[PDB]
Amino acid sequence: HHTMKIRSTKFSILNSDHPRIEVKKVFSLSPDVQVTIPYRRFKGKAKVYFQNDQIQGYFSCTDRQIDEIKISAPKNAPLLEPLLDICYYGSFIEPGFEQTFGFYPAGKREFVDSFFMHHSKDHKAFLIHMGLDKDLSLPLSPELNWKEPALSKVCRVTELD
């Protein structure tokens, strides 16, 4: 049906220029040794509602770039894992889609599992994707905790109206 799920986070497309498209990415060591690991992404604009338990909101993207995220969440909620679900959903950060994790992948299952392991341990890819701001009135801390105090904040992540 319409709603789709990445881990525990449900996604529902509000509107989009096109349906999600599939990229049949191929990784190779030699002609005889190569895996096909496809991923899905957006072509053009998209606005998508998401929800994970006490956390909900929506985000806007253009192709493989997040334009904005609006979130509603409890104070001091750790937003690491659901944000990664969004990142995977749109294939917004590497490695995990066009790049490997520093070693030739075993297959689809391994590649997806590697994504969440790798980026949980080190999530700067996301910070680079959004940007870090000097404005403190913004809600999301660099450690990706909701409304946590900090000397800098994550760009273009605000609170839902």
Numbering used by the authors: 325 to 485
Sentences from the paper on this structure:
The three largest gene segments of the Thogotoviruses, THOV, DHOV and JOSV are homologous to those of IAV and code for the heterotrimeric polymerase. In this paper we present the atomic structures of the putative PB2 cap binding and 627 domains of THOV and the putative PA N-terminal endonuclease domains of THOV and DHOV. Despite very low sequence homologies, all domains have similar folds to those of the corresponding IAV polymerase domains. However, the critical active site residues in the putative cap binding and endonuclease domains are not conserved in THOV and DHOV and, contrary to the case of IAV polymerase, neither domain shows the expected in vitro biochemical activity.
A construct comprising residues 323–486 could be expressed, crystallised in two different forms, and its structure determined at 1.8 Å resolution. Firstly, the so called ‘348-loop’ formed by the β3–β4 hairpin is longer in THOV and its extremity orientates away from the body of the domain towards the solvent, whereas in IAV the tip packs against bends the body of the molecule. This is apparently not an artefact of crystal packing as a very similar conformation of this beta hairpin is observed in the second crystal form. Finally, in all three crystallographically independent examples of the THOV domain, the equivalent position of the m7G itself is occupied by the side-chain of Arg344, with its guanidinium group stacking with the side-chain and making two hydrogen bonds to the main-chain carbonyl oxygen of Tyr413. Furthermore, given the high resolution, well-ordered structure of the THOV domain, which is the same for all three crystallographically independent copies observed, it is extremely unlikely that the putative active site region could be repacked through induced fit to allow m7G binding. Thus the significantly different nature and arrangement of the residues within the putative active site of THOV would appear to preclude any possible binding of m7G in a similar manner to that observed in IAV. The THOV domain is not retained by m7G Sepharose under conditions where IAV cap-binding domain is and, similarly, no binding of m7GTP could be detected by isothermal calorimetry experiments under conditions where IAV cap-binding domain shows clear binding with a Kd of 2.7 µM.
